[PDB]
Short mmCIF file of C-alpha atoms and ligand atoms in Angstrom, two decimals:
data_model
loop_
_atom_site.label_atom_id
_atom_site.label_comp_id
_atom_site.label_asym_id
_atom_site.label_seq_id
_atom_site.Cartn_x
_atom_site.Cartn_y
_atom_site.Cartn_z
CA UNK A 1 0.00 0.00 0.00
CA UNK A 2 2.06 2.86 1.40
CA UNK A 3 5.41 3.75 2.87
CA UNK A 4 6.36 6.04 5.70
CA UNK A 5 9.41 8.14 6.46
CA UNK A 6 11.05 8.62 9.81
CA UNK A 7 14.32 8.76 11.66
CA UNK A 8 16.30 6.91 14.34
CA UNK A 9 15.69 6.91 18.09
CA UNK A 10 17.76 5.27 20.81
CA UNK A 11 15.64 3.93 23.68
CA UNK A 12 17.69 5.71 26.37
CA UNK A 13 19.05 9.04 25.16
CA UNK A 14 20.72 12.16 26.51
CA UNK A 15 19.11 15.37 27.76
CA UNK A 16 20.53 18.66 26.47
CA UNK A 17 19.71 22.29 27.32
CA UNK A 18 18.47 23.97 24.14
CA UNK A 19 17.80 27.69 23.68
CA UNK A 20 14.14 27.59 24.77
CA UNK A 21 13.90 24.44 26.93
CA UNK A 22 15.75 22.46 29.62
CA UNK A 23 16.47 18.74 29.33
CA UNK A 24 15.48 17.69 25.80
CA UNK A 25 15.59 13.94 25.12
CA UNK A 26 18.09 13.79 22.27
CA UNK A 27 19.48 10.68 20.54
CA UNK A 28 23.20 11.27 20.94
CA UNK A 29 25.53 13.75 22.61
CA UNK A 30 29.11 14.79 23.06
CA UNK A 31 30.62 16.72 25.96
CA UNK A 32 32.18 20.15 25.35
CA UNK A 33 33.34 20.23 28.98
CA UNK A 34 36.00 17.59 29.53
CA UNK A 35 36.24 16.77 33.25
CA UNK A 36 38.59 13.76 33.23
CA UNK A 37 42.27 14.62 33.14
CA UNK A 38 45.39 12.51 32.84
CA UNK A 39 46.89 13.04 36.32
CA UNK A 40 50.49 13.41 35.06
CA UNK A 41 52.46 15.84 32.92
CA UNK A 42 52.19 14.47 29.37
CA UNK A 43 55.46 15.89 28.07
CA UNK A 44 56.61 14.08 24.92
CA UNK A 45 58.03 16.35 22.24
CA UNK A 46 59.63 18.63 24.83
CA UNK A 47 62.70 18.59 27.03
CA UNK A 48 61.12 18.63 30.46
CA UNK A 49 62.67 19.82 33.72
CA UNK A 50 61.02 18.58 36.89
CA UNK B 1 -2.30 31.78 16.94
CA UNK B 2 -5.89 31.50 15.95
CA UNK B 3 -8.56 30.87 13.38
CA UNK B 4 -11.41 32.58 11.56
CA UNK B 5 -14.13 30.90 9.57
CA UNK B 6 -17.07 31.55 7.27
CA UNK B 7 -20.08 29.29 6.76
CA UNK B 8 -23.88 29.42 6.64
CA UNK B 9 -24.23 29.42 10.44
CA UNK B 10 -21.99 32.42 11.09
CA UNK B 11 -18.45 33.75 11.41
CA UNK B 12 -16.13 34.74 14.24
CA UNK B 13 -12.53 34.41 15.41
CA UNK B 14 -11.74 31.01 16.92
CA UNK B 15 -8.54 30.01 18.74
CA UNK B 16 -6.54 26.85 19.33
CA UNK B 17 -4.69 25.55 22.38
CA UNK B 18 -2.07 23.19 20.94
CA UNK B 19 0.53 25.21 19.04
CA UNK B 20 -0.24 28.37 21.03
CA UNK B 21 1.05 26.92 24.31
CA UNK B 22 3.89 25.26 22.39
CA UNK B 23 4.88 28.72 21.14
CA UNK B 24 4.54 30.34 24.57
CA UNK B 25 6.55 27.58 26.28
CA UNK B 26 9.48 27.75 23.81
CA UNK B 27 9.87 31.48 24.46
CA UNK B 28 9.32 30.91 28.22
CA UNK B 29 12.13 28.38 28.08
CA UNK B 30 14.05 30.95 26.06
CA UNK B 31 13.10 33.40 28.81
CA UNK B 32 14.01 31.15 31.77
CA UNK B 33 17.33 30.18 30.16
CA UNK B 34 18.13 33.88 29.69
CA UNK B 35 15.91 35.36 32.42
CA UNK B 36 18.15 33.81 35.07
CA UNK B 37 20.91 34.60 37.54
CA UNK B 38 24.63 34.93 37.01
CA UNK B 39 25.64 32.77 39.97
CA UNK B 40 29.17 34.19 40.14
CA UNK B 41 29.76 37.01 42.60
CA UNK B 42 31.80 39.92 41.26
CA UNK B 43 33.81 41.81 43.88
CA UNK B 44 34.80 45.48 44.05
CA UNK B 45 38.14 45.88 42.27
CA UNK B 46 38.35 49.66 41.94
CA UNK B 47 37.49 52.51 44.29
CA UNK B 48 34.85 55.25 44.04
CA UNK B 49 35.75 57.80 46.71
CA UNK B 50 39.55 58.19 46.76
CA UNK B 51 42.54 57.71 44.52
CA UNK B 52 42.93 54.48 42.61
CA UNK B 53 46.34 54.02 40.97
CA UNK B 54 46.70 55.79 37.63
CA UNK B 55 48.05 52.96 35.50
CA UNK B 56 46.02 50.05 36.90
CA UNK B 57 42.91 52.24 36.90
CA UNK B 58 43.53 52.76 33.20
CA UNK B 59 44.13 49.00 32.93
CA UNK B 60 40.85 48.26 34.75
CA UNK B 61 39.09 50.85 32.58
CA UNK B 62 40.76 49.28 29.55
CA UNK B 63 39.62 45.90 30.85
CA UNK B 64 36.12 46.93 31.98
CA UNK B 65 35.32 48.90 28.81
CA UNK B 66 36.61 45.92 26.84
CA UNK B 67 34.38 43.64 28.94
CA UNK B 68 31.65 46.29 28.57
CA UNK B 69 32.24 46.17 24.82
CA UNK B 70 32.40 42.38 25.12
CA UNK B 71 29.04 42.03 26.87
CA UNK B 72 27.21 44.87 25.12
CA UNK B 73 28.27 43.44 21.76
CA UNK B 74 27.14 40.09 23.15
CA UNK B 75 23.91 41.58 24.54
CA UNK B 76 23.17 43.37 21.27
CA UNK B 77 24.08 40.25 19.29
CA UNK B 78 22.24 37.87 21.65
CA UNK B 79 18.96 39.80 21.64
CA UNK B 80 19.14 40.37 17.86
CA UNK B 81 19.96 36.69 17.46
CA UNK B 82 17.13 35.80 19.83
CA UNK B 83 14.76 38.29 18.13
CA UNK B 84 15.53 36.76 14.74
CA UNK B 85 15.20 33.34 16.37
CA UNK B 86 11.93 34.28 18.11
CA UNK B 87 10.46 35.49 14.82
CA UNK B 88 11.93 32.30 13.37
CA UNK B 89 10.14 30.28 16.05
CA UNK B 90 7.08 32.49 15.56
CA UNK B 91 6.90 32.00 11.79
CA UNK B 92 7.81 28.30 12.09
CA UNK B 93 4.55 27.05 13.59
CA UNK B 94 2.64 28.85 10.94
CA UNK B 95 4.08 26.10 8.68
CA UNK B 96 3.52 23.56 11.46
CA UNK B 97 -0.11 24.71 11.81
CA UNK B 98 -1.05 25.60 8.23
CA UNK B 99 0.33 22.55 6.43
CA UNK B 100 -1.03 20.03 8.95
CA UNK B 101 -4.40 21.45 7.93
CA UNK B 102 -3.56 21.16 4.21
CA UNK B 103 -2.53 17.50 4.47
CA UNK B 104 -6.07 16.61 5.63
CA UNK B 105 -8.35 18.49 3.21
CA UNK B 106 -5.98 17.60 0.40
CA UNK B 107 -8.16 15.76 -2.14
CA UNK B 108 -10.89 18.42 -1.92
CA UNK B 109 -8.40 21.02 -2.70
CA UNK B 110 -7.25 23.69 -4.99
CA UNK B 111 -5.43 26.57 -3.31
CA UNK B 112 -5.37 30.38 -3.22
CA UNK B 113 -2.43 31.05 -0.89
CA UNK B 114 -3.68 33.66 1.57
CA UNK B 115 -3.41 31.67 4.80
CA UNK B 116 -6.76 30.08 4.19
CA UNK B 117 -8.99 27.28 2.95
CA UNK B 118 -11.11 26.02 0.11
CA UNK B 119 -13.60 23.19 -0.29
CA UNK B 120 -15.85 21.29 -2.73
CA UNK B 121 -18.94 21.24 -0.47
CA UNK B 122 -20.55 23.11 2.43
CA UNK B 123 -20.63 21.55 5.89
CA UNK B 124 -21.57 22.93 9.29
CA UNK B 125 -19.47 23.95 12.30
CA UNK B 126 -18.93 20.29 13.24
CA UNK B 127 -16.18 20.29 10.60
CA UNK B 128 -14.39 23.51 11.57
CA UNK B 129 -14.39 22.76 15.30
CA UNK B 130 -12.80 19.37 14.55
CA UNK B 131 -9.96 21.11 12.67
CA UNK B 132 -8.96 22.47 16.06
CA UNK B 133 -9.40 18.91 17.42
CA UNK B 134 -6.95 17.58 14.75
CA UNK B 135 -9.73 15.08 14.04
CA UNK B 136 -11.07 15.57 10.50
CA UNK B 137 -11.98 12.77 8.09
CA UNK B 138 -12.82 12.79 4.38
CA UNK B 139 -13.38 9.28 2.91
CA UNK B 140 -17.26 9.22 2.65
CA UNK B 141 -18.00 10.95 -0.68
CA UNK B 142 -14.75 11.14 -2.67
CA UNK B 143 -16.83 9.33 -5.35
CA UNK B 144 -18.91 12.54 -5.62
CA UNK B 145 -15.91 14.92 -5.54
CA UNK B 146 -14.83 13.81 -9.03
CA UNK B 147 -18.23 15.05 -10.22
CA UNK B 148 -17.34 18.45 -8.69
CA UNK C 1 51.32 35.69 48.13
CA UNK C 2 49.96 37.47 45.09
CA UNK C 3 49.26 41.18 45.63
CA UNK C 4 45.92 41.90 47.28
CA UNK C 5 44.54 44.52 44.91
CA UNK C 6 45.74 43.11 41.58
CA UNK C 7 44.73 39.62 42.72
CA UNK C 8 41.25 41.02 43.24
CA UNK C 9 41.59 42.72 39.84
CA UNK C 10 42.63 39.42 38.21
CA UNK C 11 39.81 37.65 40.05
CA UNK C 12 37.49 40.44 38.94
CA UNK C 13 38.87 40.00 35.42
CA UNK C 14 38.99 36.18 35.38
CA UNK C 15 35.51 35.73 36.87
CA UNK C 16 34.28 38.30 34.35
CA UNK C 17 36.04 36.33 31.59
CA UNK C 18 34.70 33.17 33.26
CA UNK C 19 31.24 34.74 33.17
CA UNK C 20 32.02 35.88 29.62
CA UNK C 21 32.94 32.43 28.34
CA UNK C 22 30.47 30.41 30.41
CA UNK C 23 27.66 32.68 29.23
CA UNK C 24 29.13 32.22 25.76
CA UNK C 25 29.51 28.45 26.24
CA UNK C 26 25.97 28.13 27.58
CA UNK C 27 24.65 30.39 24.82
CA UNK C 28 26.77 28.73 22.08
CA UNK C 29 25.73 25.17 22.92
CA UNK C 30 22.07 26.19 23.36
CA UNK C 31 22.33 28.09 20.09
CA UNK C 32 24.03 25.10 18.47
CA UNK C 33 21.52 22.67 20.05
CA UNK C 34 18.62 24.72 18.68
CA UNK C 35 20.52 24.95 15.40
CA UNK C 36 21.30 21.21 15.37
CA UNK C 37 17.63 20.39 15.93
CA UNK C 38 16.97 23.04 13.28
CA UNK C 39 19.36 21.24 10.93
CA UNK C 40 17.89 17.93 12.08
CA UNK C 41 14.27 18.91 11.40
CA UNK C 42 15.23 20.72 8.17
CA UNK C 43 16.03 17.67 6.05
CA UNK C 44 12.80 16.11 7.06
CA UNK C 45 11.31 18.82 4.79
CA UNK C 46 14.15 18.28 2.32
CA UNK C 47 13.47 14.52 2.32
CA UNK C 48 9.69 14.37 2.73
CA UNK C 49 8.66 16.98 0.17
CA UNK C 50 11.05 15.77 -2.54
CA UNK C 51 9.09 12.54 -2.25
CA UNK C 52 5.75 14.39 -2.43
CA UNK C 53 6.68 16.31 -5.59
CA UNK C 54 7.05 13.00 -7.47
CA UNK C 55 3.94 11.00 -6.48
CA UNK C 56 1.92 14.18 -6.72
CA UNK C 57 -0.83 13.38 -9.24
CA UNK C 58 -1.60 10.06 -7.54
CA UNK C 59 -2.06 11.82 -4.34
CA UNK C 60 -4.31 12.72 -1.54
CA UNK C 61 -2.60 13.14 1.82
CA UNK C 62 -2.95 12.09 5.47
CA UNK C 63 -0.08 13.98 7.10
CA UNK C 64 1.67 11.43 9.31
CA UNK C 65 5.09 11.39 7.64
CA UNK C 66 3.88 8.91 5.08
CA UNK C 67 2.48 7.99 1.68
CA UNK C 68 -0.62 7.15 -0.29
CA UNK C 69 -1.26 5.77 -3.76
CA UNK C 70 -3.92 4.89 -6.35
CA UNK C 71 -2.49 1.45 -7.25
CA UNK C 72 -0.32 -1.34 -5.84
CA UNK C 73 3.18 -1.89 -7.21
CA UNK C 74 6.07 -4.06 -6.04
CA UNK C 75 9.35 -3.21 -4.30
CA UNK C 76 10.82 -1.93 -7.58
CA UNK C 77 8.95 1.31 -6.85
CA UNK C 78 9.93 1.78 -3.20
CA UNK C 79 13.61 1.00 -3.76
CA UNK C 80 13.68 3.63 -6.52
CA UNK C 81 12.35 6.25 -4.08
CA UNK C 82 15.69 5.88 -2.34
CA UNK C 83 17.32 6.12 -5.80
CA UNK C 84 15.51 9.47 -6.43
CA UNK C 85 14.45 7.81 -9.69
CA UNK C 86 10.66 7.38 -9.78
CA UNK C 87 8.45 7.98 -12.83
CA UNK C 88 4.68 8.20 -13.22
CA UNK C 89 3.54 9.07 -16.79
CA UNK C 90 2.37 5.58 -18.04
CA UNK C 91 -1.23 5.30 -16.76
CA UNK C 92 -2.38 8.77 -15.68
CA UNK C 93 -5.25 8.08 -18.14
CA UNK C 94 -6.39 5.33 -15.74
CA UNK C 95 -5.88 7.39 -12.56
CA UNK C 96 -8.84 9.64 -13.43
CA UNK C 97 -10.96 6.47 -13.33
CA UNK C 98 -9.68 5.92 -9.77
C1 NAG D 201 27.15 8.86 19.34
O1 NAG D 201 28.44 9.49 19.41
C2 NAG D 201 29.45 8.62 19.95
C3 NAG D 201 30.71 9.45 20.08
O2 NAG D 201 31.07 9.63 21.44
C4 NAG D 201 29.62 7.38 19.07
O3 NAG D 201 30.56 6.50 19.67
C5 NAG D 201 28.29 6.67 18.85
O4 NAG D 201 28.44 5.64 17.89
C6 NAG D 201 27.22 7.66 18.39
N1 NAG D 201 25.92 7.01 18.20
C7 NAG D 201 25.15 6.44 19.14
C8 NAG D 201 23.85 5.86 18.64
O5 NAG D 201 25.47 6.37 20.33
C1 NAG D 202 37.70 54.97 34.89
O1 NAG D 202 36.44 55.27 34.24
C2 NAG D 202 35.48 55.94 35.08
C3 NAG D 202 34.22 56.10 34.26
O2 NAG D 202 34.11 55.11 33.25
C4 NAG D 202 36.06 57.26 35.56
O3 NAG D 202 35.13 57.88 36.44
C5 NAG D 202 37.38 57.02 36.28
O4 NAG D 202 37.97 58.26 36.67
C6 NAG D 202 38.34 56.26 35.37
N1 NAG D 202 39.60 56.01 36.06
C7 NAG D 202 40.79 56.17 35.47
C8 NAG D 202 41.98 55.87 36.33
O5 NAG D 202 40.91 56.52 34.30
C1 NAG D 203 -13.83 18.19 19.72
O1 NAG D 203 -13.31 18.05 21.06
C2 NAG D 203 -14.30 18.10 22.10
C3 NAG D 203 -13.55 18.00 23.40
O2 NAG D 203 -12.17 17.73 23.18
C4 NAG D 203 -15.31 16.97 21.91
O3 NAG D 203 -16.32 17.08 22.90
C5 NAG D 203 -15.94 17.05 20.53
O4 NAG D 203 -16.79 15.92 20.31
C6 NAG D 203 -14.86 17.08 19.44
N1 NAG D 203 -15.44 17.15 18.10
C7 NAG D 203 -16.19 18.15 17.59
C8 NAG D 203 -16.65 17.95 16.18
O5 NAG D 203 -16.47 19.17 18.22
C1 NAG D 204 41.20 34.58 43.63
O1 NAG D 204 40.23 33.51 43.51
C2 NAG D 204 40.73 32.21 43.88
C3 NAG D 204 39.62 31.22 43.62
O2 NAG D 204 38.74 31.67 42.60
C4 NAG D 204 41.18 32.24 45.34
O3 NAG D 204 41.72 30.97 45.68
C5 NAG D 204 42.21 33.33 45.55
O4 NAG D 204 42.58 33.42 46.92
C6 NAG D 204 41.67 34.68 45.08
N1 NAG D 204 42.66 35.72 45.26
C7 NAG D 204 42.37 36.93 45.74
C8 NAG D 204 43.52 37.88 45.86
O5 NAG D 204 41.22 37.25 46.06
C1 NAG D 205 18.55 1.63 -7.74
O1 NAG D 205 19.98 1.79 -7.66
C2 NAG D 205 20.74 0.59 -7.88
C3 NAG D 205 22.19 0.96 -7.68
O2 NAG D 205 22.34 2.37 -7.53
C4 NAG D 205 20.45 0.03 -9.27
O3 NAG D 205 21.15 -1.20 -9.43
C5 NAG D 205 18.95 -0.20 -9.44
O4 NAG D 205 18.68 -0.60 -10.78
C6 NAG D 205 18.17 1.07 -9.12
N1 NAG D 205 16.73 0.88 -9.29
C7 NAG D 205 15.94 0.04 -8.59
C8 NAG D 205 14.49 0.05 -8.98
O5 NAG D 205 16.35 -0.68 -7.68
#
């Protein structure tokens, strides 16, 4: 008979703060604010004086 | 957003709840994101009554008027971005209202392009109230519409 | 032991710049989120109407995100919709009987 169109939806998504809402259930996300560091001085390519 | 209609029983400006409150909540969210508090407390870095240092007062005034030109450019750009966005999200649910009407009356239809309607028949206000219910149906005399 | 006044000036400056960038970061992401959902909803229109301008003389419409037809054809039709390569002209003279 017919077709439909659509998109993709993950069953457990991420909530982002848009411009006119708070907590919008979005499929995917990234994280502009990196919280996890490497707790050492990554110093290859330099001569490094502790 | 609203409606207005013309038939044999009368006329008069209707209204609709669905996309109205959607429009008011998107700007209220746009309000409450922006109508909000800067949580950071800014201290008092320069004096008002006696004798701040000449160079660092010029540095602070260079810094503050930069930051003033930073935020006022931001405030002018933000509001003008949000104004253009608000008129974008005001004009958007014209399309979201007007075409979800046109994909229901569609086999009756020719079109004029005013923001309005046309028909093959004449029915009462049971039709036009159901347009605001999103609950219109057509299938019962398409076999007569080809005669029209 | 940083100096008391210029440390307050730097903290006035940094927390301003912190309030500059964090307002910018909150505004940017929320602008980009609204823009990403704008450029996610946009090619619904760019996909769904470029389908509707091809089946158009068969058509009435329901408005779900979907399709209707006058006939029944096999999967050679619906695979060609994804090829952007559908054609209609061969029995419009029978569609007026439908
Ligand atoms: C979402 O983005 C991440 C990148 O961190 C990627 O690994 C993943 O495949 C993407 N898609 C889904 C459905 O999670
Ligand atoms: C800094 O600017 C204010 C007004 O913007 C002025 O009253 C004050 O005298 C200025 N201070 C210096 C050191 O230029
Ligand atoms: C419209 O909605 C109201 C309440 O939601 C309902 O009572 C009514 O039957 C619906 N249909 C029409 C044609 O008014
Ligand atoms: C500046 O702020 C930091 C934390 O934001 C604080 O540890 C430091 O003591 C402050 N310095 C002065 C001079 O206020
Ligand atoms: C669709 O595209 C494929 C490859 O692009 C081609 O082999 C095929 O003939 C096209 N048409 C249909 C109806 O599948």
